Structures are given as structure tokens and as C-alpha cells.
Design an enzyme around this catalytic site. Sequence first.
Site, PDB file in Angstrom:
ATOM      1  N   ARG A  30     -17.738  13.925 -25.704  1.00 24.84           N
ATOM      2  CA  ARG A  30     -17.316  13.540 -27.037  1.00 24.84           C
ATOM      3  C   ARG A  30     -15.791  13.516 -27.108  1.00 24.84           C
ATOM      4  O   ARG A  30     -15.114  14.208 -26.339  1.00 24.84           O
ATOM      5  CB  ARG A  30     -17.868  14.516 -28.072  1.00 24.84           C
ATOM      6  CG  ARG A  30     -17.307  15.914 -27.925  1.00 24.84           C
ATOM      7  CD  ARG A  30     -17.692  16.789 -29.090  1.00 24.84           C
ATOM      8  NE  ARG A  30     -17.311  18.174 -28.846  1.00 24.84           N
ATOM      9  CZ  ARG A  30     -17.608  19.183 -29.651  1.00 24.84           C
ATOM     10  NH1 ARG A  30     -18.284  18.996 -30.772  1.00 24.84           N
ATOM     11  NH2 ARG A  30     -17.222  20.411 -29.320  1.00 24.84           N
ATOM     12  N   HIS A  75     -27.185  25.641 -14.977  1.00 24.67           N
ATOM     13  CA  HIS A  75     -27.877  26.829 -15.447  1.00 24.67           C
ATOM     14  C   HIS A  75     -29.208  26.371 -16.030  1.00 24.67           C
ATOM     15  O   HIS A  75     -29.267  25.346 -16.721  1.00 24.67           O
ATOM     16  CB  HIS A  75     -27.045  27.603 -16.476  1.00 24.67           C
ATOM     17  CG  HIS A  75     -27.734  28.820 -17.011  1.00 24.67           C
ATOM     18  ND1 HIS A  75     -28.380  29.727 -16.201  1.00 24.67           N
ATOM     19  CD2 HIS A  75     -27.889  29.271 -18.277  1.00 24.67           C
ATOM     20  CE1 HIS A  75     -28.905  30.684 -16.945  1.00 24.67           C
ATOM     21  NE2 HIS A  75     -28.615  30.435 -18.208  1.00 24.67           N
TER      22      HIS A  75
HETATM   23  N1  LIG Z   1     -18.799  30.018 -15.466  1.00 24.69           N
HETATM   24  C1  LIG Z   1     -19.798  29.686 -16.362  1.00 24.69           C
HETATM   25  O1  LIG Z   1     -19.629  29.920 -17.568  1.00 24.69           O
HETATM   26  C2  LIG Z   1     -20.978  29.061 -15.791  1.00 24.69           C
HETATM   27  C3  LIG Z   1     -21.574  29.563 -14.520  1.00 24.69           C
HETATM   28  C4  LIG Z   1     -22.536  28.588 -13.939  1.00 24.69           C
HETATM   29  C5  LIG Z   1     -23.010  27.552 -14.649  1.00 24.69           C
HETATM   30  N2  LIG Z   1     -22.614  27.341 -15.985  1.00 24.69           N
HETATM   31  C6  LIG Z   1     -23.357  26.414 -16.842  1.00 24.69           C
HETATM   32  O2  LIG Z   1     -22.617  25.209 -16.947  1.00 24.69           O
HETATM   33  C7  LIG Z   1     -22.771  24.677 -18.284  1.00 24.69           C
HETATM   34  C8  LIG Z   1     -21.431  24.681 -18.989  1.00 24.69           C
HETATM   35  O3  LIG Z   1     -20.705  25.715 -18.464  1.00 24.69           O
HETATM   36  P1  LIG Z   1     -19.134  25.768 -19.228  1.00 24.69           P
HETATM   37  O4  LIG Z   1     -18.955  27.269 -19.290  1.00 24.69           O
HETATM   38  O5  LIG Z   1     -18.422  24.850 -18.314  1.00 24.69           O
HETATM   39  O6  LIG Z   1     -19.253  25.091 -20.675  1.00 24.69           O
HETATM   40  P2  LIG Z   1     -17.745  24.927 -21.363  1.00 24.69           P
HETATM   41  O7  LIG Z   1     -16.752  25.613 -20.472  1.00 24.69           O
HETATM   42  O8  LIG Z   1     -18.007  25.433 -22.741  1.00 24.69           O
HETATM   43  O9  LIG Z   1     -17.386  23.326 -21.390  1.00 24.69           O
HETATM   44  C9  LIG Z   1     -17.799  22.876 -22.645  1.00 24.69           C
HETATM   45  C10 LIG Z   1     -17.802  21.354 -22.600  1.00 24.69           C
HETATM   46  O10 LIG Z   1     -18.825  20.835 -23.442  1.00 24.69           O
HETATM   47  C11 LIG Z   1     -18.207  19.857 -24.271  1.00 24.69           C
HETATM   48  N3  LIG Z   1     -18.997  19.749 -25.510  1.00 24.69           N
HETATM   49  C12 LIG Z   1     -19.297  20.758 -26.448  1.00 24.69           C
HETATM   50  N4  LIG Z   1     -20.053  20.324 -27.478  1.00 24.69           N
HETATM   51  C13 LIG Z   1     -20.258  18.960 -27.189  1.00 24.69           C
HETATM   52  C14 LIG Z   1     -20.958  17.957 -27.869  1.00 24.69           C
HETATM   53  N5  LIG Z   1     -21.605  18.255 -29.050  1.00 24.69           N
HETATM   54  N6  LIG Z   1     -21.020  16.672 -27.388  1.00 24.69           N
HETATM   55  C15 LIG Z   1     -20.348  16.453 -26.196  1.00 24.69           C
HETATM   56  N7  LIG Z   1     -19.634  17.304 -25.430  1.00 24.69           N
HETATM   57  C16 LIG Z   1     -19.606  18.584 -25.962  1.00 24.69           C
HETATM   58  C17 LIG Z   1     -16.730  20.369 -24.510  1.00 24.69           C
HETATM   59  O11 LIG Z   1     -15.962  19.361 -24.943  1.00 24.69           O
HETATM   60  P3  LIG Z   1     -14.753  19.852 -26.249  1.00 24.69           P
HETATM   61  O12 LIG Z   1     -13.547  20.328 -25.434  1.00 24.69           O
HETATM   62  O13 LIG Z   1     -14.646  18.512 -26.913  1.00 24.69           O
HETATM   63  O14 LIG Z   1     -15.584  20.900 -26.934  1.00 24.69           O
HETATM   64  C18 LIG Z   1     -16.418  20.822 -23.068  1.00 24.69           C
HETATM   65  O15 LIG Z   1     -16.081  19.703 -22.303  1.00 24.69           O
HETATM   66  C19 LIG Z   1     -23.721  25.638 -19.025  1.00 24.69           C
HETATM   67  O16 LIG Z   1     -25.015  25.192 -18.805  1.00 24.69           O
HETATM   68  C20 LIG Z   1     -23.444  26.956 -18.283  1.00 24.69           C
HETATM   69  O17 LIG Z   1     -24.483  27.876 -18.349  1.00 24.69           O
HETATM   70  C21 LIG Z   1     -21.502  28.001 -16.472  1.00 24.69           C
END
Ligand SMILES: NC(=O)c1ccc[n+]([C@@H]2O[C@H](COP(=O)([O-])OP(=O)(O)OC[C@H]3O[C@@H](n4cnc5c(N)ncnc54)[C@H](OP(=O)(O)O)[C@@H]3O)[C@@H](O)[C@H]2O)c1
Lengths: 318, 318
Positions: free
Chosen positions: A46, A105
Amino acid sequence: KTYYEQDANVGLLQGKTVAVIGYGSQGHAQAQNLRDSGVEVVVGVRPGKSFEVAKADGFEVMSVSEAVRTAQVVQMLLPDEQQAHVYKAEVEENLREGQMLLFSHGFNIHFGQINPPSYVDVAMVAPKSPGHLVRRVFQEPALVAVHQDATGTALHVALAYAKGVGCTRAGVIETTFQEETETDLFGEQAVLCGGVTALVKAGFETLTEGGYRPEIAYFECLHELKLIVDLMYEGGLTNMRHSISDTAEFGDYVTGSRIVTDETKKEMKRVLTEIQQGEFAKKWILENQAGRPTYNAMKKAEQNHQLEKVGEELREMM
Amino acid sequence: KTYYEQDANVGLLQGKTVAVIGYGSQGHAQAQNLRDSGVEVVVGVRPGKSFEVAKADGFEVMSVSEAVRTAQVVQMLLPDEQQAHVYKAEVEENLREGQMLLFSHGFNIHFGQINPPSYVDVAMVAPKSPGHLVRRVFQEPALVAVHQDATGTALHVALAYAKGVGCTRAGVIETTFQEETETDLFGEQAVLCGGVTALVKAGFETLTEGGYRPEIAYFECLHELKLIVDLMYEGGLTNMRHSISDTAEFGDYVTGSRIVTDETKKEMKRVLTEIQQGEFAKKWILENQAGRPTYNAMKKAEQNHQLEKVGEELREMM
Ligand SMILES: NC(=O)c1ccc[n+]([C@@H]2O[C@H](COP(=O)([O-])OP(=O)(O)OC[C@H]3O[C@@H](n4cnc5c(N)ncnc54)[C@H](OP(=O)(O)O)[C@@H]3O)[C@@H](O)[C@H]2O)c1
Ligand SMILES: NC(=O)c1ccc[n+]([C@@H]2O[C@H](COP(=O)([O-])OP(=O)(O)OC[C@H]3O[C@@H](n4cnc5c(N)ncnc54)[C@H](OP(=O)(O)O)[C@@H]3O)[C@@H](O)[C@H]2O)c1
């Protein structure tokens, strides 16, 4: 069973567009980790800060709809709590046959928040280290799970993403969506994030309530912890036990059992049981449906703690 | 009150021999940390592996007796439990007027195991990071306490050792022997070493007893911890809270209080109280007098745990 670099070949992605949906902690690193390895990456996010940060990173940033329409590998890297809303409204109607629906995840698949159609592969590559580390390590681990195999290559396509991000270098262990979801949640709740922060805070408060200087308590309860855990990483508890004084190691032995009792173990089994029964998932799902009244309050309290407050000055100077 | 580089000048050591007694985790780093900074260092250690390793390090390795006789700064870096035996039999009779008797942990002074004569300065420089780190950081923190000032410069001589080892760079906080001893012991027992290893083991065992793969439990309970604590070091709990998913941070908030209860806090206060009343000191002192029947057994059990066993293969490949 651990797939390695010899078990994977990114050639299954030559001419294949990987749509990275989301561009955050995991989205930015994996998209840049695939980038170097000749992986054609398109980012679907987005508009906002993720949209323009991915643009300035030189990518082809488009909407989530257009990203699913023009890709064969859809990698879901939105927050777990946003993936189902974005899926039904922007992914589902654009999924075609033979596409891979990838996660890092297993929460939304295992707890029935995303119900993919039958003509796509559903797999997972769950890296164990946060983004920035996945990025710089590749510039110089993960679990793999296959939920639904429609093409007969979902395991080898997912290992091409593992090879593309570069996890087959260190090595990839095969699991299931259920097992990854259940243990990932249990680890961060009972040990890594919930237990340790509560243990650090309790020690800090015991010292401050004991009349000791708050700055002194910061060093021996929080700041020295990094140096303690680094040794644990390199060689387990044994290595860390050896760098510290015998006075410290003997304290460990006679005090650990006092802090973490049979009753703490029983409570951990209740934490695990509530994870297995979807009860935590329900709690977090309804939490988000309610407007996070509970997450926001508790987040603000944790940031107003003296440990975090006194931690400011201490880290500045050095 | 934090003394810094501008508060210290090693010139008080120009022509002054610092006898480093012992050459282990702290002895090797501090002696080499003083070495670069033009500090004339003589190592006093019994024959053995420390004797020849300090010799191959290019030093003037001699007995503890001869080291005290020819030095003005005696730095006690033997194990806490050996310092009193070596002191009365090799240091005491060779102490002269104006010598500095230095420690890096206040145990033996605060619990009356070493009773220094009145004509020496007694001070402490307690670095917060283990040896190897003190070494390489200087090649490119600590507490200071003054127990007995006979020359009127013990604080500034001890800051010349702080500057000589290079702790005034990052910064040195002034404390007392009692406060350093009590909080150093409490931190490693209740939090850093006793609490965390017990918490990691309890989580690991909950997963293995839950039917989950032992190798999987190793990642989410022990191996991911280093990456969790690294973030905590850089910016407190707040920073670590932000790199992890909101699913993880929300688990933290709702689970930490379940693992570490009001009852865990009460037990920590008992740990602290037993430290303040010399009861732990007595336990560790008599433990060593008995031939360590308790330390050796518990050490062997901790090294035979499945977490340490499964930890072997996992760390090898990657
Ligand atoms: N280290 C970890 O946390 C970790 C470990 C392994 C796997 N994972 C998995 O990987 C996935 C994400 O991990 P993350 O921690 O990378 O998430 P994140 O850091 O919160 O990245 C969030 C992303 O989602 C986008 N987003 C949020 N709401 C949205 C919407 N309504 N429409 C479109 N885009 C949207 C954000 O864009 P804006 O900047 O515009 O909000 C940002 O690009 C999850 O399933 C998590 O469990 C994470
Ligand atoms: N990171 C820490 O553990 C830490 C933190 C801050 C301060 N300190 C304090 O620094 C002091 C030592 O720390 P450490 O961990 O460096 O001790 P260490 O690593 O155990 O070094 C032990 C040294 O003592 C020598 N030694 C043992 N018994 C001896 C004897 N009977 N006569 C002569 N030399 C003997 C050993 O020589 P062999 O090789 O011949 O045994 C070795 O050189 C303690 O007071 C400790 O509390 C340590």
C-alpha cells in the site's frame, strides 16, 4: 532432515517474478536478499513509507492487487494481523493456477485465517533471524514447510526461495505449518521475549527497591545480558559458564532452580496448551478487532519503565 | 558521578610497575590492555598454562611473591575463591607502604576474606565486559570503588588503571566495595546466568516434553535468544520490541507476567537478602573448603542436558 545449497537451485525462478507483499522487517531484507541473487522481485505494498522506501530502494513498487496479477510467487510479508484483510480483498481474486503462496510465519494458515484455493502451492520459509541480519549475511537459518502441493515442486520452489534468500547456505530444516506456528509463538512468549523481559525487569526492580542505584542495576540486569547471551550462542550454556567466574557459575547452579520452579514449568505448559488450542490466536485476533485497547496501553507502560528510562543516558555516552 | 578520560592520566604510572596477579579471563585482557598504553606490566602467576601463555605473550612472568616485591600496583585477578589462600601465603608479607592493592571484584574485601594492612591503598576497577572484549575494544565500561585511601591518590591511581586499561574512554561509575559485590552477585544469580539458563531450559523442556523436535526447540528457545538480546542492548526493551512482529510483542506483554510472578519477585528478594547477609558467601566458601562436591556434580549435569547436546550439531554446520 535439512535441505542445503546442493538441495536447491534458483533456476526454477529464472524468468519467474517473486511478488514480495509488504516491505518491512522481513519484506525489505528478503526482497534485497533475493535481489542480489538474480531474483526478479516486484514489491506489492500500500502507499506510504514502505511504498516510497521500496521505491528509493530501486524496486518496482505497485499495489498488492497488481503484484499478485503479474507474479508467480506471492510472498506474504504483511503483519500477521493484517494478512487476512488484505488477502480476501486484494490477493484471492487474483490468484491463478500454479502460483506459489508463500509465508514466513504459519499463523494465518494454521489458525484458518487464510483459506487458499486449491490451484496454488502453499509453502513457508521462516527465517530465524530478523531482517537486517538476513540482508547483510547474504551480502557476504530458516524452516521450510509445505502446506499444499499442487505443482509437485512446492518443496523445490520453496527451496529456490530459500536458495534465493540464501538460507540453504546455512541450512533449512523441514517442518509443518502447525509445528512452526506453535513453537514460534511459545518461544517468544515463554522464553525469548515475555520471560526474559519480565526476568530482567524483576531483577532490576529488586535492586532499585533494595536501595541500589538505578544506573548500577541497569548494568548487571540488562546491559551485561548481551555479553552473557553472545557466549551462549557460540557454544551453548557450557561456553558462557566458562567465561564467567566460578563464583558466577556456582551462583547460576544454586539460584536458577529458585527462580524458575516446577510451578513456572506448569505455567509454561499452560501457555503452550493455549497456543495449541487457538486460545492465544483468538485473543490476539479479537484484540485487533477491538482496536488494540490492551496492546497499546501495555506497550506504553513498558516504554515508561525506569529500566527503559535510565537506559537512555547509559547507552548514549558509550 | 562518572569519571571520564579527562578525569584520569596514566602519568601516575610512568615508571610504576603494575603486577597483574593471575592471567586468566580478566588477567590476560587487562595485562594486554595496559600493555599497549605504555603500562609496564609484570605478571605474577603460579607455574602452569597461565605461566607459559603469559610468557609466550612476551611478558615477564614470575611468582606471585616476586611480583608483589617488585611492583607498586598489585592487581588481584585470581579466582575469588583462591585469592585469600594466595594472599596470606604470598602477598601479605611482601606488601610495602604506598602500594596499591587492586581488585576487579569486591568479594574478598567485602566479605572479610582479605584484611589488608593499613599502609596500602585498596581500590577496585570492575569491568562489566569479560576479558576478550576488554582486549579488542582497547586495541581500537567499569565501576570504580575506593575501599582504603592511604596515599590520598587511590581514586586517581585507580583511574590511571582505568585509563591504562582504557575504561575512562567509555566511562567509569563510582561505587563502593559492598554495592559492587552485592549487585554483581545478585545479577548473575537471579537474572543473567541463573535465571536465564533456567528459563531457556524450562522452555526447551516444555517443547520437547510436548512432542516437538528437539532441534526445533533449540532454535526458538536458545539460538534465537542472542538476536533477541542484541536488540535489547542497542536500545533497551523498546528496540527489541520493534524488530519483532506485533504478534510477538503482544505475546510478550500477556505472557511475561505469567512466567515471572509476584512470587518470583519475592524469591529474588530472598536471593538478595542472602547475599547481603553473607549467607551465599558462606555457602560458596564452605563449598570450596569441602572440595566442591556440589559445584562439580551440578556442572556435569548442566553439560549433559539435551539442550547442550542437541546444541552441538546445530552450531557446527552454520
Ligand atoms: N522478525 C520477525 O518479526 C519475523 C520472523 C519471521 C517471520 N516473520 C513474519 O513475516 C511477516 C511480516 O514480518 P514483519 O515483522 O516484516 O512485518 P513488518 O515488519 O510489520 O512489515 C510490515 C509491512 O506490512 C505493510 N502493511 C501493513 N498493513 C498493510 C496493508 N493493510 N496493506 C498493505 N501493506 C500493509 C507495511 O507497510 P507500511 O510501512 O505502509 O505500514 C510494511 O511494509 C509476518 O508474517 C511475520 O510473522 C517475521
Ligand atoms: N568476567 C569475569 O569472570 C569477571 C568480571 C569482572 C571481574 N572479575 C574478577 O576478576 C578476578 C578473576 O577473574 P577471572 O574470571 O579472570 O579468573 P580466571 O579467569 O579464573 O583466571 C584465573 C587465573 O588465576 C590463576 N590461579 C588460580 N589459582 C592460582 C593459585 N593458587 N596461585 C596463583 N595463580 C592462580 C590461573 O592460573 P592457572 O592457569 O595456572 O590456573 C589463572 O591465571 C575475580 O576476582 C573475578 O571476580 C571477573
